[PDB]
Scaffold this active site. Structure first.
Site, mmCIF file in Angstrom:
data_model
loop_
_atom_site.group_PDB
_atom_site.id
_atom_site.type_symbol
_atom_site.label_atom_id
_atom_site.label_comp_id
_atom_site.label_asym_id
_atom_site.label_seq_id
_atom_site.Cartn_x
_atom_site.Cartn_y
_atom_site.Cartn_z
ATOM 1 N N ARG A 132 0.829 -1.204 0.000
ATOM 2 C CA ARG A 132 0.000 0.000 0.000
ATOM 3 C C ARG A 132 0.863 1.254 0.000
ATOM 4 N NH1 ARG A 132 -2.233 2.503 4.495
ATOM 5 N NH2 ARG A 132 -2.475 0.488 5.598
ATOM 6 N N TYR A 137 -13.667 15.956 -17.288
ATOM 7 C CA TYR A 137 -14.232 14.613 -17.199
ATOM 8 C C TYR A 137 -15.395 14.548 -16.207
ATOM 9 C CZ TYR A 137 -14.318 9.496 -16.529
ATOM 10 O OH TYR A 137 -14.700 8.175 -16.418
ATOM 11 N N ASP A 187 -4.667 17.750 -15.883
ATOM 12 C CA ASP A 187 -4.964 16.388 -16.309
ATOM 13 C C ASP A 187 -4.495 16.236 -17.753
ATOM 14 O OD1 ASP A 187 -5.983 13.973 -17.198
ATOM 15 O OD2 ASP A 187 -7.945 14.235 -16.287
ATOM 16 N N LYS A 226 -6.139 5.168 -20.140
ATOM 17 C CA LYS A 226 -6.278 5.594 -21.550
ATOM 18 C C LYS A 226 -5.010 5.303 -22.291
ATOM 19 C CE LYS A 226 -10.016 6.613 -19.551
ATOM 20 N NZ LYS A 226 -10.477 8.027 -19.466
HETATM 21 C C1 PLP Z 1 -4.024 -4.246 7.662
HETATM 22 C C2 PLP Z 1 -5.414 -3.649 8.254
HETATM 23 C C3 PLP Z 1 -6.102 -2.642 7.616
HETATM 24 C C4 PLP Z 1 -5.623 -1.947 6.301
HETATM 25 O O1 PLP Z 1 -5.748 -2.777 5.168
HETATM 26 P P1 PLP Z 1 -4.887 -2.486 3.904
HETATM 27 O O2 PLP Z 1 -5.336 -3.456 2.808
HETATM 28 O O3 PLP Z 1 -3.469 -2.649 4.277
HETATM 29 O O4 PLP Z 1 -5.115 -1.082 3.453
HETATM 30 C C5 PLP Z 1 -7.301 -2.158 8.165
HETATM 31 N N1 PLP Z 1 -7.808 -2.694 9.354
HETATM 32 C C6 PLP Z 1 -7.151 -3.667 9.979
HETATM 33 C C7 PLP Z 1 -7.735 -4.258 11.301
HETATM 34 C C8 PLP Z 1 -5.932 -4.165 9.432
HETATM 35 O O5 PLP Z 1 -5.274 -5.194 10.129
HETATM 36 C C1 PLP Z 2 -11.178 8.346 -18.239
HETATM 37 C C2 PLP Z 2 -10.627 9.748 -17.627
HETATM 38 C C3 PLP Z 2 -10.437 9.926 -16.276
HETATM 39 C C4 PLP Z 2 -10.753 8.843 -15.194
HETATM 40 O O1 PLP Z 2 -9.831 7.776 -15.203
HETATM 41 P P1 PLP Z 2 -10.238 6.404 -14.591
HETATM 42 O O2 PLP Z 2 -9.002 5.501 -14.623
HETATM 43 O O3 PLP Z 2 -11.364 5.873 -15.382
HETATM 44 O O4 PLP Z 2 -10.680 6.596 -13.178
HETATM 45 C C5 PLP Z 2 -9.958 11.154 -15.794
HETATM 46 N N1 PLP Z 2 -9.666 12.201 -16.675
HETATM 47 C C6 PLP Z 2 -9.846 12.040 -17.982
HETATM 48 C C7 PLP Z 2 -9.509 13.217 -18.951
HETATM 49 C C8 PLP Z 2 -10.334 10.798 -18.484
HETATM 50 O O5 PLP Z 2 -10.508 10.676 -19.874
#
Ligand code: PLP
Ligand code: PLP
Ligand code: PLP
Ligand code: PLP
Ligand code: NA
Ligand code: NA
Ligand code: NA
Ligand code: NA
Lengths: 395, 395, 395, 395
Positions: free
Chosen positions: B58, B111, B183, B208
């Site tokens: 993460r 968008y 963007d 894209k």
């Molecule tokens: C590890 C954990 C998270 C966070 O999950 P992620 O997939 O790492 O973002 C949230 N709550 C608990 C209790 C966790 O052990």
């Molecule tokens: C498709 C698009 C997004 C959003 O991207 P996602 O990966 O679908 O969340 C944002 N800005 C522009 C200009 C886009 O064409």
């Protein structure tokens, strides 16, 4: 309708079926961004929500849909929503529910990044959070305010595996007109079902037990269809954008197929290791729901079908002993995750919380000799012998 | 140091190298959640940010790190941060930068889900947004306030492919003490580089062109190291949790290897199709930066190295003609994405915006006969013949 | 019917379509071993070959089927069969066609592991092989015997990029009642089509150009439906078991989408680098079909639509110069594959053939200063500058 | 050295370790074809076999190497070699060991495609095969000839789950100077270890239990290092080319992590279902090593640590009853594989062997009412209730 079979059958089959195009047994990996419509009419039908299909993977996807349906079944919720991380499941939930002016009552013994989100990010958006000891339900009641939209809890909680009476907290929250959100990550649906106890929303990091194979970062949200649609069409689509990739969904579907037998082995292995640690003269405290000395033992017996795969324990001699012992394992691996098939160990006083003031950490339950253990699927005698060797070394 | 080679060489090599363990040429898929430390000391070193390694996917991951370094190089930014979606790159950016009380000036031709985030989610957290016509930089200046932290733009913009003078807007934002976020999704770094023109932060949907193969939902954020660290250790870790799965990073690294040759073919194909549409008596308007009749043609020539792969155009006879023509293609596919290797077509008046009041849509630039075309890598004569057949049908 | 469009359109669309269940544009990854039947009747129908469906991935699979159909279209063959490696495509072919007592006439300038298979494994099963110089078609005729089932060729051939007149060899083989099998790996269908010239069977390592991204080991076989069914239901099912995993098929489908634009850039880049090497006073010989000095230049112009992405060349000063130069590149990578997006270089005299007697290697066309170059998609000036730097160093 | 821990610990850890570059816990997916050398010297070192590294994925790969080391440990063999399919593991073995003139003694109750390979493909290459009833070891001895290189067996064997005394057959083969190759697919190393009983080579379809998740086609070969090097550098490299893709290796590593707990649940579930079927008045015969009525029950108790997850049984009323019952399950799935987490069922008389003469099939042990059941990880009461419902229907 898979909601009718035994819980192991459901773990195997719920939300899944042979592919209608080809009979492929494994759910296909629909690793696509775009979906094609047969007609202009179909595009308009699906977009206004008047037709059920697929449009775009950020919104929904057949592989992710299976994972969502399965975990909805296992938690006994109406609907599921998968997310890019457990954190994303938590914040997509609360940012969907809360706005400027709203308030949250939250356990203080919660996951660190959840604590940072509530402590520092939420008040930055005008959403205030009161932190309480969720093991005393009166503290939850005392902190509630006319603005409170959500009570938030984790059980069992880190680092000492304290418990939270879900059914009791649910009644308190509901009486004051708030929702109960429960992070059920430590337990998985196999061991604990908050929604059956009156919780409104269940969140998981599927990173931990639900996937179980230490190769996926993910989260899931389970609850009523009306809330889940908001969390999907506003929370995910507009606010977090934390959608799960269809490959990660497919790995989680595959990992969860062995959830029942993995949790059985985790908990059987963990019970043996906890009893071993309770008998060891160099171990001052063992925190584990399956041990009788646990302060909330009988609540755990009502609320959890198994005591879990996580143990915490304190080692004779504080900070330097915990460091010696952690640098002396040769089979447990030093890592901060949990729920993997390998046994994982961490010493928060000399790792995650090393530059934190000692009595700052001690208010937060983390003592100098506290070690957290994620018990894997190895042979317990091997884990125990390793622990015994390292403890013996460390003193 | 790959920042020294030609831009094609950089697309191939920047951020990547043979694996130091094994010489594997392809960047390995580090599909892991957890990382193991050799010592308690190492865990503490990495966690307080005093040591450079990995901890948890993460937070960071070697496969994702390569994608981040590459796109940082191609945009000429210091650092990159990958995300679960383009939406997540946008909101992780702005929720990192803005808090209760802050203000944003934003193009209105942006968008759709960005518009919903700014219009409905941002003011819900106490963050106000003024929407302006970003093709007139004075409108940007007029809307600026003492609270304005961010100016937000998209160029070229949907649906009519209007342009925004990045260098001019950057000076306006900077004088009033605000950041410019751009963007750059439509253009990719191969065709336009906002940071060279004075933008502070560049966001992409890698869904894209950057991935280009219609099989990944993702986003990226490029900018200064100091902002990117905040967007990672607060924005991702705590607020959105929108991390990219390492498999999605690896597919994006693989897709981006052909970015330069794909964009060349997209734009060469698109120029031919735009000229064909400009000559067709049933096509009332063609919107394309490469056509001389384009209102901001010379700005496009300064600011973009190629006119792009997207065309919009209006068909004789409004809503029913656009529907006939869209239901009459047999090689272009009806879908709402863009940037894929297949040619994609959508008719927003009878698909995405079908239950919107006609003159509500027309204020938003979407006319009854407007069609948007994502030109693929097919043979242009085949795309043209298909378009000619369907247009001819539709009238 | 995609066989009707231009060759770029076919590269994009042939064998593929939106998923009939869901509209997913990307072909799903049917990563399954088992397929489920609706009825006992269906299982019996599919197994005796009286019904068209799927049964088991070793036999067939929807993802692999798309790859097979696509490459069948691009080679103008009736049917395709994918395999675990290029070697597996070659041996599944010949072990399907040949039995104890049969004979094969084969080019001697062929891939090394093919040479070991023919030289040592084939005669071990009672199948004799005569090796000839396939650049002189009379040698092919002289070696033919009443037992000859197959003539086997590779063009262009390693290491000197000599050519083989496919149309002429095809007539010779056919007159004596034998099949012509052509390994078209170096060229890909974009540059050369043996079946249009009279070959019966085309084999590829898709590891090289067809996938193009250096992340897949695979092969393909194209030819008549009647032979391909034998190669599938006997050769694969029973003899080699060399089936392609559906993930590898999906990566190859994705890589091949840019085949046309990749081969154009490879060959344009390669032509520039060959001309640079032809002008360099430290380079004694350059072998490249696009150079006029090439011994079979006009045959290459009839038989290949582009001169290819592979160059060989000899460096002033033999074994030690080639070693110096190869240890002195900083952008070309030392590796034995070809067809990747990165430029790859190898010095066979001090790498692959280092413990081979010098005049044993020289009979096999490999001189002490011979270097083989797989030209990538980098900027050619960067590749050239690197080569110039290393050559200059090496002398 | 992982060969020292308990067998569950080995299933989790053998052949695996945190990545030395990054600490990544999950073995990385080295999805690459090519490997890069640092020097010309290194290429020459690795190629002549004087240095240990990687060169090319067809030859070896770090992800595949882990799978190979793990399964070598679990079978107590020196070395492992992974393959594209179980068939490929079998034929790569025998085509490495046998040449024109050699002979093989083989059980007749073996997997169908193995029977076709031995019956029709082997004699085509000059290698003769005698088929015997391997449950009577004297038949094995009687068939042995001066040319016999290999005795080949499968235990338990399909379709009636007859057994083969490995230790006794191993002594017979060894006395006459032949190798014993055992297909251990049905049992997995968790339940049976042929090499400890004197077998020389163990082959698996990892498609079945070792992967366990019905999403991988693969095989493995375990035995002495000297034979395995030949099977790799001649058998794979030159003859079959049946290498495993690194993604398939990684999925198999992940699936095998739960081998021990899966086999326990399979066999516990299977024992319950076999006892249920033995008590059912409509079931004429139940074939299962765990039932006392099994003809070789005590041999199974010596040779297998668990009776296995496969059951065969015969249903009152022959061909039409078996068809009714198979068309009447609603939880068991009709498919021809086994070893998946889902319960799978097939009726060979009306599916796989439907156009075979009835008394041709009956010589081969397949009666009109024979059903084969692959017992999954569902709740056994659910499987039983389903079976009871369908049996009851079918009569
Ligand atoms: C590890 C954990 C998270 C966070 O999950 P992620 O997939 O790492 O973002 C949230 N709550 C608990 C209790 C966790 O052990
Ligand atoms: C498709 C698009 C997004 C959003 O991207 P996602 O990966 O679908 O969340 C944002 N800005 C522009 C200009 C886009 O064409
Ligand atoms: C590389 C190559 C092969 C072998 O292909 P693999 O996929 O490596 O087994 C066969 N023929 C030629 C001409 C090759 O270049
Ligand atoms: C299924 C099976 C095989 C063949 O394995 P594949 O991976 O399908 O090629 C070989 N032996 C036995 C005993 C099997 O059950
Ligand atoms: Na209990
Ligand atoms: Na231009
Ligand atoms: Na040419
Ligand atoms: Na037993």
């Amino acid at each position: 309708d898979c909601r009718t079979y035994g819980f192991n059958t459901q773990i195997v089959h719920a939300g899944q079926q042979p592919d209608p195009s080809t009979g492929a047994l494994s759910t296909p990996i629909f690793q696509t961004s775009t979906f094609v419509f047969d007609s202009a009419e179909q595009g308009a039908a699906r977009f206004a929500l008047e037709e059920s299909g697929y449009i775009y993977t950020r919104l929904g996807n057949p592989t992710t849909d299976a994972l969502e349906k399965k975990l909805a079944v296992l938690e006994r919720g109406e609907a599921g929503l998968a997310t890019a991380s457990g954190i994303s499941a938590i914040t997509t939930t609360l940012l969907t529910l809360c706005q400027q002016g709203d308030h949250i009552v939250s356990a203080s013994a919660i996951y660190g990044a959840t604590h940072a989100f509530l402590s520092h990010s939420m008040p930055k958006f005008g959403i205030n959070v009161s932190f309480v000891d969720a093991a005393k339900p009166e503290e939850i009641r005392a902190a509630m305010r006319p603005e409170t939209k959500v009570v938030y809890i984790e059980t069992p909680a880190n680092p000492t595996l304290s418990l939270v009476d879900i059914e009791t907290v649910a009644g308190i929250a509901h009486q004051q007109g708030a929702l109960l959100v429960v992070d059920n990550t430590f337990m998985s649906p196999y061991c604990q079902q908050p929604l059956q106890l009156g919780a409104d929303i269940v969140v998981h990091s599927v990173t931990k037990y639900i996937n179980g194979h230490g190769d996926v970062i993910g989260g899931i949200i389970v609850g009523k269809q009306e809330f889940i649609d908001q969390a999907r069409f506003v929370g995910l689509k507009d606010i977090t954008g934390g959608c799960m990739s269809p490959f990660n969904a497919w790995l989680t579907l595959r990992g969860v197929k062995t959830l029942g037998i993995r949790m059985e082995r985790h908990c059987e292995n963990a019970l043996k290791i906890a009893r071993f640690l309770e008998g060891h003269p160099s171990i001052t405290r063992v925190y584990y729901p399956g041990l009788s000395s646990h302060p909330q033992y009988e609540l755990g017996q009502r609320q959890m079908s198994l005591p879990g795969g996580i143990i915490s324990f304190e080692i004779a001699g504080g900070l330097e002993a915990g460091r010696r012992m952690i640098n002396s394992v040769e089979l447990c691996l030093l890592a901060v995750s949990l729920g993997d098939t390998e046994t994982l160990i961490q010493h928060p006083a000399s790792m995650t919380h090393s530059p934190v003031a000692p009595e700052e950490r001690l208010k937060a339950g983390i003592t100098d000799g506290l070690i957290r253990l994620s018990v894997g699927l190895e042979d317990p005698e091997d884990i125990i012998n390793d622990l015994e060797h390292a403890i013996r070394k460390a003193t």
